[PDB]
């Protein structure tokens, strides 16, 4: 009596998806 059709395959899976240094201090002073 014609066997039943095979169940559909399963759905596929899935995989989801510095500051600059401060300037140098000024020179001391002229003599």
Automatic annotation (TrEMBL):
Organism superkingdom: Eukaryota
Residues recorded with modification 4-hydroxyproline: 1-13, 16-17
Protein known as: C-type lectin domain-containing protein
Lineage, opening ranks: Eukaryota, Viridiplantae, Chlorophyta, core chlorophytes, Chlorophyceae
Shown part of the complete sequence: 1453 to 1469 of 7988
């Amino acid at each position: 009596p014609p066997p039943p059709p095979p169940p559909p395959p399963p759905p596929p899976p899935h995989a989801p998806p510095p500051p600059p240094p401060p300037p140098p201090p000024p020179p001391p002073g002229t003599p």
